[PDB]
Specification:
Chain lengths: 165, 75, 75, 144, 733, 64, 40, 80
């Protein structure tokens, strides 16, 4: 398979790893009674463990010789072989949220610079104003492009202080 | 104080353990602290007649074991 | 200063006080190795730091694994 | 105004002494003498540590460096409203009056003073170091 | 006033212990000396370079002499696999009898040190076979050392001092150095390989006494003058050749086998002869490029003036840079250090993976020491390159003479450069550290399957392109139906493909998620070190905080507590900060190299593949596990030959920690303390009869930074050297 | 008469000034012929904590 | 009340509330969707 | 000795002179500023280089500048 890896569903090491993890919990479960709270907690952990190994194999992760899932980061390989949900799709999930936070903060900063005392709005947050901007940040990718195309995203060099050179 | 350790590290590295400051070599016994321990271990006999035992087992005497482990013993 | 004080206390108690008591006698946690090893810097690095750090660096996967994480976090 | 003359006979403030005073530098290189007139007996702090009592009238103290004399001058001027002066005394007996240089303290502009080390330009108008390279020693562009 | 130093009258009149310290520190900063002129500066540098050359050759003479006198080179050549090379003999009256016995090893009569420098493998590969060879070489290099020392004296004499214009003839020097110093030297080394080294590797002795009657090839120069150059590639050494003997030997002198010698597991001597012959031709031709007294060639100034993009994207382009570079010794030294610094790293990266010397690969300690040795030297050299780049901007740069060219335009967007370097460093730091910490938590909770393991597909793809069939990409040299595979299938691909698909050597080692994480750690180190060094250079002349910084020079304490406080504001201090990061970066690089080879050498690469994805794995399995033999070099029960490394290991920790004193506690505290000692001495009877000539003072602010860094750096290096050697040789010694 | 009007906005052109390329408000303009008659006040303090400085006539240009 | 709600709008208090909310959201997602390593 | 220079941006506020712990500076008549006085540095042989004067200067950039130079007993602040 990709880069000599093998699917985790077909990996002997992957299957062996699950047995060891469950075996460790089973050993601890012997010293407790069937209905006792420690027994219930240990079995709940065992159910989660079995579900975890079942889900990762179902998702089609590739496993190395160690039996551990390995992620695929090249967009071409990820999209060609159905690994887009490992790095590629998460990539755009992050950039949407990260830009959301950045864009909302930038809007608040610009909004309060027109006030009488801008610095007072940075240590005592204008929560009504902050809340309104938070909800409107869901469309930042559209808003950001329009500023880029309108020439208003960036400031002109003549207004930026620099040191002597 | 720290120089004595450096002396000991160097002698040990050079294979001259007989030249080290140690119990089996040049000795540096804390005789004053040893004397104080003996006095406190013998206090019940003479200088604390109404005390059954010494204040602490670190002075000397017999160890106390609880649950198969040492609670305290002479140091 | 206080780092050495507590290292002194930790090694001395393990070596010469704490231990298990059986018919054969008292077996201390580190087997009384303070007297002959604690007089060199290499003794402290080897017999105290390197040897006794085995527990913390091997705690991953156990209930003590939180101390392994904090050990690295504190470094 | 004229330069005062030091009077070595002047009594010194009541003080039991300390380990913070003069060293061998005073015997071989130079030391400093500060004198002032006190309106009343009063306790002040020695720059070398401890409390001393200034005698009513003339007072005289000796110090190891110029900053010590001026440190006591600042205390006396601001906390007691006095007007001290001090000298530099060389081992061979020569005395050099120092402060106030012309009888008027420097913070007050006085006529007859000639400007020194005054550049008729801004800092930003100094030349680049490459222009003073190989001038005979290490020198900044601010030295021209 | 005091005589010393003669070059600084300001220092000579300093009445404190400052003067002796600064007399030493400023001794080689010629530009700052009293009465220095530009022409005298160049002549002083020229003489100093002769001094360096004689020292280097004397140092090489000493190594040859001691191996011949006290080594076991003759015994080593009979069985290089099972004999440890001897560096020199030990004579230490402080040793006890057990130490005398412990260090008596390698067949020598008395105590000796084992060589880790690899000179045995190098000298053996080039034809040296007996102690007489080493002795003669030693005497020859001592003579060459004396000649260079004399030449340095000679060119200081009135009739032998070159003029300033001689030193500024760039075109002539480049021609001679490219064709003569690089080309002819490479051609001469080819002659040695063809006439001596290659015959010696085939069991034939060729020396000064008979080299004029021994044909390097059965057909002597007939193929060379008739164009039948393929006659020299016929009958190469067979796969069964025994190095140093005539068994299985060939007759070729110039080949392109392109792999490793099966026995020595190093490069073929006939490939190394053809390499230098081709390099010699390239460099000889390259040295006929620039104009001299013969009316042909290029003028370097003309080339630079011409390369200006028409669109104006680089402004004036390279106009004025000939004078800028030619008139600045610091611009030249910055370029030289950057070029040599990168070349040193290339030497490290290529020598371990393509071992040129016979039986180098199997000497694990030598392999580790050489890679670590040259990578640390590269790291220091790179810091110097940027240091002298910052010195250039202050002392030598002229804004008026560089108006609008590429150099002046770098200063115009320095904020853009620094802020983007800052972004890259932040991104790498947050996410590389984050992934390691995520994997440590997954390991701690007993769920290694939940850790984030990103396959290095981009690097594995490059390895496949080179012919590594493990990953299954199968293109270029990994695809048997590609034109690249077919075209080279008769020249070098068979040897190369055999070597690259053997997982028992260091040629393109297999890589995985553990290699992915550490490579991004290295990128973090390179970018952060560059950020500090670049910021230091570009702000060297001034900042918003200190607009007139260039008026204060390269190195100065600070600008005082005003304007918020200005500690470590000088460009010199930026370099001081950068060295810590250079040491950290090289430390990460060498830890990576060492651990990956230790597990390969032990036949268990899985330990690295599984432990390197989280940081407790590095702490537990690399450092803690491999310290056991080192720290037992001596103990209450005895000592062994690793006691010297055990002692040096702690020696390194001690110096390292002493450096923390100078870095953390600063001057004012100490100056007050020394004053009480001054008072005490003058008041003590029988001791105040003695007195100092230099008034004691605490070290200066700048001096503390340098001394503290020196202790930090020396302890850093010694600690690792002891660990590297002891953990490797103890395992494989 | 000389210099910008009081209360107007100006842009600083002195390269070594903390407020280079920034905008301040004119406080007063000395008419006595001093070297730096224009007094400017700024919203943001410099590293020393100062918010007012003196400039020459050619070191200030009307904002916008 | 105006002043008290002004106090609750200071940076440390807002940071406490916002990070308590953000942490709660991330913890509760992992409670109902345990051991997420990839997107499916 | 250290090098102290006064530049023509001085406003004659006298704060550098008041802050000097060594009495290196003084005020002299001038006509280039409204205060009609400029700072002067007549006695630089006594400057220790503390830079308290620079801390006290209100102008931007500074009007009084100290460049640390050769070290003597006076400039080093030694009392021995
Ligand atoms: C960060 C740099 C980087 C690197 C080193 C690679 C490397 C690779 N990519 Mg990837 N790729 C990247 C970024 C990168 N990619 C990005 C940012 C994108 C999104 C725009 C893609 C989109 C992409 C696609 C769509 C494909 C690859 C493919 C490949 C592999 C073979 C093609 C090749 O020669 O690529 C070398 C890379 C470069 C010279 C840089 C530009 C690469 C472009 C964007 C893709 C070229 C595709 C190529 C023409 C396909 C040929 C046919 C294929 C069957 C071999 C190779 C391992 C191919 C593959 O093997 O898919 C399974 C493939 O089909 N990549
Ligand atoms: C409005 C918030 C905001 C925005 C939009 C940006 C944007 C940027 N920053 Mg900056 N930054 C911010 C806040 C912000 N920053 C803060 C608070 C700090 C102090 C910790 C920094 C410290 C900082 C550094 C040190 C660097 C940047 C850099 C950058 C650039 C690259 C992105 C990056 O590296 O981010 C990294 C982001 C951080 C290090 C801090 C982010 C902290 C949070 C998430 C920001 C929002 C908090 C705020 C209170 C929200 C208000 C909401 C409102 C409704 C009340 C980019 C221009 C880099 C640069 O110059 O690249 C060229 C760079 O080197 N920033
Ligand atoms: C053919 C004539 C010639 C030759 C042979 C040289 C030779 C030299 N000149 Mg030059 N020079 C010449 C003409 C020549 N010059 C002319 C005409 C002028 C006037 C225009 C000058 C002006 C001049 C100056 C002003 C200076 C020199 C200097 C030098 C020395 C440089 C330092 C050194 O040792 O580098 C050694 C370099 C090499 C061996 C070349 C290879 C470098 C690579 C990168 C190393 C790696 C190769 C290989 C892998 C190494 C294997 C190692 C082994 C352990 C396995 C060198 C001896 C400098 C010096 O030191 O003077 C005392 C110096 O300051 N020259
Ligand atoms: C600089 C290196 C060098 C030197 C000094 C020598 C020297 C020698 N070689 Mg060797 N050789 C070398 C490189 C060298 N070789 C290389 C690179 C190869 C591989 C191609 C060989 C292959 C080789 C063979 C196969 C043979 C020799 C032979 C000889 C010997 C007789 C040559 C003769 O009769 O020439 C007479 C030829 C001429 C007078 C004309 C020479 C014309 C060329 C173009 C001169 C170029 C000079 C050059 C630019 C300057 C270099 C530096 C200078 C100080 C030498 C002689 C001792 C022969 C011998 O008998 O060895 C025992 C012999 O059979 N050599
Ligand atoms: C070809 C190489 C080269 C050359 C010719 C120069 C030349 C110069 N450099 Mg540069 N430099 C270089 C490489 C070079 N450098 C490198 C590699 C670095 C990075 C490390 C630097 C970093 C650097 C800085 C930061 C500075 C210079 C400066 C200078 C100048 C003065 C040097 C001086 O007086 O030193 C005097 C040297 C000493 C007093 C000895 C220093 C000893 C060090 C700290 C190591 C000590 C090791 C210790 C003794 C080991 C003990 C071991 C134990 C077991 C016993 C001079 C023009 C200075 C300058 O002002 O330039 C204008 C300056 O500030 N250089
Ligand atoms: C292990 C020690 C260490 C660490 C972690 C750092 C980290 C950093 N250094 Mg520093 N540095 C160190 C030692 C260290 N340095 C030493 C010994 C020196 C020599 C004096 C320097 C000298 C130095 C210089 C000169 C520079 C740096 C720079 C940097 C940054 C590099 C980019 C980066 O990693 O961004 C990512 C950031 C990090 C990895 C930092 C840790 C972030 C943590 C994990 C956040 C955790 C938050 C979490 C919610 C917990 C908060 C708890 C709290 C509220 C109680 C970063 C902030 C450069 C810089 O600023 O670049 C922009 C820079 O110029 N360092
Ligand atoms: C568990 C998941 C996780 C976590 C906790 C983090 C955490 C972090 N990431 Mg990371 N990241 C992740 C996953 C994660 N990342 C993944 C899966 C990817 C894809 C490979 C990335 C890619 C990524 C990038 C590219 C960057 C980070 C950055 C950051 C740091 C600052 C974020 C910030 O302040 O945003 C608040 C936002 C701001 C302060 C300003 C905006 C910053 C964003 C990143 C710009 C996005 C631009 C967007 C693509 C639009 C382009 C312009 C156009 C529309 C006009 C922070 C420590 C930033 C960093 O390290 O900066 C030094 C950064 O630049 N991350
Ligand atoms: C670079 C930093 C980094 C990155 C990229 C990750 C990434 C991840 N970590 Mg790890 N982690 C890190 C640092 C990092 N971690 C550190 C420093 C620590 C120590 C505190 C941990 C401790 C840790 C634990 C204990 C766990 C993780 C887990 C996870 C996963 C969480 C996925 C999730 O909640 O999806 C939820 C889905 C989302 C979409 C989240 C965002 C929700 C908003 C509403 C989306 C809005 C979209 C419009 C993910 C693979 C968990 C796991 O299962 O890993 C396999 C897990 O149990 N991490
Ligand atoms: C759109 C449709 C598709 C085709 C687009 C073609 C665009 C062509 C470019 C025009 C873009 C353009 O207008 O360029 C303009 C500018 C060239 O400036 P000049 O002043 O020299 O020339 C302007 C000319 O347009 C007219 O003279 O170049 C750039 O800014 C980028 C050059 C990229 C050069 C690429 C090669 C760089 C290699 C560097 C080393 C790499 C080493 C590592 C890898 C081996
Ligand atoms: C600051 C400064 C300075 C300094 C600088 C420095 C220090 C730098 C460095 C730099 C560096 C350090 C750089 C480097 C670079 C590199 C590169 C650029 C590379 C490239 C490469 C390539 C291109 C390759 C290719 C290839 C491959 C990859 C494979 C196959 C083959 C071939 C060849 C094709 C100076 C003095 C100037 C002065 C001014 C200022
Ligand atoms: S540096 Fe200090 S001593 Fe010198 S003039 Fe300024 S305030 Fe006075
Ligand atoms: S503090 Fe500055 S502006 Fe004021 S008198 Fe001194 S130099 Fe002039």
């Amino acid at each position: 398979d990709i880069a000599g890896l093998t699917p985790c569903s077909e990996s002997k090491a992957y299957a062996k790893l699950e047995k060891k993890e469950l075996k460790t919990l089973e050993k601890r479960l012997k010293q407790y009674e069937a209905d006792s709270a420690p027994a219930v907690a240990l079995k709940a952990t065992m159910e989660r463990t079995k579900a975890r190994f079942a889900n990762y194999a179902k998702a089609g992760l590739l496993c190395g010789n160690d039996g551990l899932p390995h992620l695929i980061a090249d967009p071409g390989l990820a999209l060609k072989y159905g690994h887009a949900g490992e790095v590629f799709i998460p990539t755009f999930g992050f950039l949407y949220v990260a830009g959301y936070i950045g864009y909302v903060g930038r809007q608040y900063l610009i909004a309060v610079k027109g006030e009488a005392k801008p610095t007072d709005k940075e240590i005592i947050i204008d929560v009504p104003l902050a809340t309104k901007l938070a909800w409107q940040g869901a469309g930042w990718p559209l808003a950001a492009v329009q500023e880029l195309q309108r020439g208003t995203l960036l400031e002109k060099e003549e207004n930026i202080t620099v040191s002597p050179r | 104080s720290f120089g004595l350790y450096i002396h000991n590290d160097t002698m040990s590295a050079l294979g001259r353990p007989q030249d080290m400051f140690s119990d089996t070599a040049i000795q540096l016994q804390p005789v004053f602290a040893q004397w104080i321990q003996n006095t406190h271990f013998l206090a019940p006999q003479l200088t604390a007649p109404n005390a059954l035992a010494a204040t602490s087992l670190t002075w000397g005497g017999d160890l106390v074991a609880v649950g198969g482990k040492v609670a305290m013993m002479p140091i | 200063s206080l780092s050495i004080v507590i290292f002194h206390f930790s090694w001395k108690m393990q070596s010469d006080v704490w231990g298990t008591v059986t018919a054969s006698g008292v077996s201390h946690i580190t087997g009384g190795n303070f007297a002959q090893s604690a007089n060199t810097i290499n003794g402290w690095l080897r017999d105290f730091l390197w040897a006794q750090s085995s527990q913390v660096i091997q705690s991953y996967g156990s209930a003590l694994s939180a101390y392994g994480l904090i050990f690295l976090g504190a470094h | 105004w004229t330069v005062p003359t030091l009077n070595p006979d002047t009594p010194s403030p009541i003080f039991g002494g300390s380990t913070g005073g003069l060293l061998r530098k005073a015997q071989t290189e130079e030391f400093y003498v500060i004198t002032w007139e006190a309106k009343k007996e009063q306790i002040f702090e020695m720059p070398t540590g401890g409390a001393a009592i200034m005698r009513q009238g003339p007072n005289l103290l000796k110090f190891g460096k110029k900053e010590q004399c001026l440190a006591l001058t600042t205390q006396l001027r601001n906390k007691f409203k006095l007007t001290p002066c001090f000298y530099r005394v060389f081992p061979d007996g020569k005395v050099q009056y120092l402060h106030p240089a012309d009888g008027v303290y420097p913070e007050k502009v006085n006529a007859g003073r000639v400007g020194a080390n005054q550049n008729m330009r801004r800092i930003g108008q100094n030349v680049n170091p490459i222009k003073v390279k190989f001038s005979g020693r290490m020198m900044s562009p601010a030295e021209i | 006033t005091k005589l010393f130093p003669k070059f600084s009258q300001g220092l000579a009149q300093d009445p404190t212990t400052r003067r002796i310290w600064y007399g030493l520190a400023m001794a080689h900063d010629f530009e700052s000396h009293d009465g220095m002129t530009e022409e005298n500066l160049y002549q002083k540098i020229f003489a100093s370079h002769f001094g360096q050359l004689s020292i280097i050759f004397l140092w090489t003479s000493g190594n040859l002499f001691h191996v011949a006198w006290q080594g076991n080179f003759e015994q080593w050549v009979t069985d290089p696999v099972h004999i440890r090379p001897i560096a020199h003999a030990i004579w230490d009256p402080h040793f006890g009898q057990p130490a005398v016995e412990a260090f008596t090893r390698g067949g020598a009569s008395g105590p000796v040190n084992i060589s880790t420098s690899g000179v045995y493998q190098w000298w053996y590969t080039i034809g040296m076979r007996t102690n007489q060879d080493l002795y003669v070489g030693s005497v020859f290099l001592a003579l060459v050392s004396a000649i260079f020392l004399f030449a340095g004296w000679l060119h200081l004499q009135p009739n032998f001092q070159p003029s300033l214009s001689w030193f500024k003839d760039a075109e002539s020097r480049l021609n001679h150095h490219l064709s003569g110093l690089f080309g002819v030297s490479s051609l001469a080394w080819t002659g040695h390989l063809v006439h001596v080294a290659i015959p010696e590797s085939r069991g034939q002795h060729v020396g000064w006494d008979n080299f004029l009657s021994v044909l390097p090839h059965p057909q002597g120069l007939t193929p060379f003058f008739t164009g039948n150059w393929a006659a020299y590639a016929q009958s190469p050494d067979t796969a069964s050749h025994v190095f140093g003997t005539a068994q299985g030997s060939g007759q070729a002198i110039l080949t392109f086998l392109g792999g490793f010698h099966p026995q020595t597991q190093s490069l073929w001597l006939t490939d190394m002869a053809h390499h230098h012959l081709a390099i010699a031709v390239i460099f000889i031709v390259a040295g006929h490029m620039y104009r001299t007294n013969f009316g042909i060639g290029h003028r370097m100034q003309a080339i630079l003036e011409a390369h200006t993009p028409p669109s104006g994207s680089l402004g004036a382009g390279h106009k004025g840079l000939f004078d800028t570079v030619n008139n600045s010794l610091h611009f030249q030294l910055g370029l030289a250090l950057a070029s040599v610094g990168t070349i040193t790293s290339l030497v490290a990266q290529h020598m371990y993976s393509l071992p040129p010397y016979a039986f180098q690969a199997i000497d694990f300690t030598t392999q580790a020491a050489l890679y670590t040795h040259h990578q640390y030297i590269a790291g220091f050299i790179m810091c110097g390159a940027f240091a002298h780049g910052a010195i250039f901007f202050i002392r030598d740069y002229d804004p008026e003479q560089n108006k609008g060219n590429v150099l002046a335009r770098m200063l115009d967007h320095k904020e853009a450069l620094i802020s983007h370097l800052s972004w890259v460093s932040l991104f790498l730091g947050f996410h590389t550290l984050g992934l390691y910490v995520h994997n440590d938590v997954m390991q701690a909770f007993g769920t290694p399957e939940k850790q984030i393991l990103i396959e290095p597909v981009f690097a594995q793809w490059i390895q496949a392109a080179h012919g590594k069939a493990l990953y299954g990409f199968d293109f270029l040299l990994s695809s048997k139906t590609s034109a690249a595979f077919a075209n080279g299938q008769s020249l070098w691909l068979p040897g190369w493909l055999d070597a690259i698909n053997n997982n028992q050597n260091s040629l393109f080692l297999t890589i995985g998620p553990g290699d992915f994480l550490v490579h991004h750690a290295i990128a973090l180190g390179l970018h952060t070190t560059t950020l500090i060094l670049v910021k230091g250079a570009l702000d060297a002349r001034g900042s918003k905080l200190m607009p007139d910084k260039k008026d204060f020079g390269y190195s100065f304490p600070c600008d005082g507590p005003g304007r918020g406080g200005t500690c470590d504001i000088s460009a010199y201090d930026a370099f001081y900060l950068a060295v810590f990061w250079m040491l950290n970066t090289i430390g990460w690089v060498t830890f990576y190299w060492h651990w990956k080879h230790l597990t390969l050498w032990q036949g268990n690469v899985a330990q690295f593949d599984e432990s390197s994805t989280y940081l407790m794995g590095w702490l537990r399995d690399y450092l803690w596990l491999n310290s056991s033999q080192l720290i037992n070099g001596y103990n209450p029960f005895g000592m062994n030959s690793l006691s010297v490394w055990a002692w040096t290991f702690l020696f390194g920790h001690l110096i390292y920690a002493t450096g923390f004193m100078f870095l953390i506690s600063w001057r004012g505290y100490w100056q007050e303390l020394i004053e009480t000692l001054v008072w005490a001495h003058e008041k003590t009877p029988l001791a105040n009869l003695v007195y100092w000539k230099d008034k004691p003072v605490a070290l200066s602010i700048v001096q503390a930074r340098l001394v503290g860094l020196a202790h930090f750096s020396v302890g850093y290096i010694f600690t690792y050297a002891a660990f590297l050697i002891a953990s490797t040789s103890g395992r494989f010694g | 008469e000389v210099g910008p009007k009081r209360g107007s906005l100006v842009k600083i052109l002195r390269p070594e000034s903390y407020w280079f390329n920034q905008v301040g408000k004119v406080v007063s303009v000395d008419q006595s012929g001093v070297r730096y008659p224009v007094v400017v006040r700024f919203e943001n303090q410099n590293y020393a904590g100062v918010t007012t400085n003196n400039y020459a006539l050619d070191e200030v240009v009307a904002a916008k | 009340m105006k002043d008290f709600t002004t106090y609750l709008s200071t940076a440390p208090v807002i940071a406490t509330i916002w990070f308590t909310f953000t942490a709660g959201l991330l913890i509760e997602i992992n409670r109902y969707f345990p051991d997420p390593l990839v997107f499916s | 000795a250290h090098i102290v220079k006064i530049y023509d941006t001085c406003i004659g506020c006298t704060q550098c002179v008041r802050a000097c712990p060594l009495d290196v500076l003084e005020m002299v008549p001038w006509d280039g500023c409204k205060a009609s006085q400029m700072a002067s540095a007549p006695r630089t042989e006594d400057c220790v280089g503390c830079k308290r004067c620079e801390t006290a200067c209100p102008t931007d950039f500074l009007s009084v500048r100290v460049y640390l130079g050769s070290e003597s007993t006076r400039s080093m602040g030694l009392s021995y």
